[PDB]
């Protein structure tokens, strides 16, 4: 059934699993028309499909042309997500296919189940965790590849950079979730924290800066402070 705080270490066992987040698939700006009505204009989106044990991120870029002439786009976006996830699974060798797919939003359950009927042995699960994967478009390199895309495209990343050389996947996922939660609560402050010191760089093949172990402890502490603050600033506490 659902994945929650009780069964959290399951994410880091040796059964292949993927999280799927659809929150950035259908993205729009809302604007006024010459007549004073309101309209939307789509911008490119992405499906965020992540193996939490290895850090592998299958980032399927959703180009605005897929919405041309279609109705009920928010509903279609869920089915398009499920179609692309199913296509990804079918493209992987059998030994690389997931045994579980965890959707971050429960409205993805029926679309993914129907698209995966050919895979009765892959479990489709919801979660009770409020995971911050919507903030993936606050990662500069990810936002850049999405906004520049001129056609549908899949781009593969490791969202943990090289962290798994020095830390476990539990610790790496916890660091990722902290970073993304911070970027979601106050993107400007979060990004200042990450890029304040100019002597720490992001390698060309990485997404995050090359912090030493000690600097990561300091960074992580700064991000917790932010989340607690903003939580004060918000509820006035």
């Amino acid at each position: 059934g659902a994945m929650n705080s009780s069964n959290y270490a399951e994410l880091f066992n040796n059964d292949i699993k993927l999280f799927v987040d659809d929150t950035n698939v259908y993205r729009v700006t809302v604007h006024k028309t010459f007549e004073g009505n309101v309209a939307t204009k789509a911008i490119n989106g992405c499906i965020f499909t992540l193996n939490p044990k290895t850090g592998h991120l299958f980032l399927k870029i959703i180009h605005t042309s897929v919405w041309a002439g279609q109705k009920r786009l928010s509903q279609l976006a869920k089915w398009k997500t499920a179609e692309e996830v199913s296509a990804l699974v079918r493209s992987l060798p059998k030994e690389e296919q997931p045994k579980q797919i965890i959707v971050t939003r429960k409205a993805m359950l029926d679309p993914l189940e129907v698209h995966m009927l050919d895979f009765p042995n892959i479990a489709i699960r919801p979660t009770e965790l409020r995971l911050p994967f919507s903030a993936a478009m606050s990662i500069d390199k990810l936002s850049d590849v999405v906004m520049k895309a001129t056609e549908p495209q899949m781009v593969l990343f490791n969202i943990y950079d090289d962290w798994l050389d020095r830390i476990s996947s539990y610790t790496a996922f916890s660091r990722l979730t902290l970073l993304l939660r911070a970027l979601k609560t106050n993107e400007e402050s979060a990004k200042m924290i990450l890029l304040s010191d100019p002597t720490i760089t992001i390698k060309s093949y990485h997404l995050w800066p090359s912090f030493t172990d000690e600097q990561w402890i300091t960074i992580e502490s700064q991000m917790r402070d932010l989340i607690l603050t903003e939580y004060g600033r918000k509820y006035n506490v």
Binding site: W79, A82, E83, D110, P111, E113, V114, H115, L117, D118
Partner: protein, 300 residues
Amino acid sequence: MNTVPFTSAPIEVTIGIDQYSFNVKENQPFHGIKDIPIGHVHVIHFQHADNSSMRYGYWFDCRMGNFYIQYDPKDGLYKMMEERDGAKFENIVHNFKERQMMVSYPKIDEDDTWYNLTEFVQMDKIRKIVRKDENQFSYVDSSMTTVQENELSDPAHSLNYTVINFKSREAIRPGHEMEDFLDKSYYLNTVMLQGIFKNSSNYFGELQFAFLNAMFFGNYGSSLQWHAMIELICSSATVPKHMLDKLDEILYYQIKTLPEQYSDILLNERVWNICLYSSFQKNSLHNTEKIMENKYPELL
């Protein structure tokens, strides 16, 4: 007008015959039901006074044989049997009519309720859902499970309703996942009607039989089947207009006959609200929506 003779009534029992029921006391001089209308299937059903657990009964059509009931003290139930000696049977029914030991099927002349509940129900289709080929009548009880319930444990005692599953390869054409899931017309019209049932009359017959088993025996898998067959039609954007008009009549009479005190367990809130207010057919079931809103506004 046909007759079902009872050898005797050795245990106190409530006997129902279609929508009617009468109370028989232990060893009361009870010898059957006469004046049963010809042309319809019928059900004769039983609830013992001492153990209201297990309602059970028999679907039959008196055109197919001469049937009687006799109490078996070993298996502890009233059993339907066929009498092959027409001479003996006609003689027995006569002697019993003379002594006024049989109750008369109490139908009001104006009343079309039983016809309206069984319009499409045929004994031959009942006998394919309830498989016991050596008898011309069919036993059903409260506890019998359906084939679909058994997939999720005695096959001989199962209700072989047609399996309906909205998240199945049968229901979903490869490449039409969203389309077929959100509009079930291909599963209704091509898979079920053209492929399995052959026509809408057979579909409606099974739907009507499922409802009646739910209502008379509290058979849970039959209630599930009834609602699934309703939901399949309501969730189809494309349904022949004659089928929608007939469904409205069918459901109207089912809702009219449903005991008020059983509506809480026999009606699924989700299905009815979806069907009457959200589905493609939300504006096609006028009679059913009107009786539901006036009789069971709470559920909605």
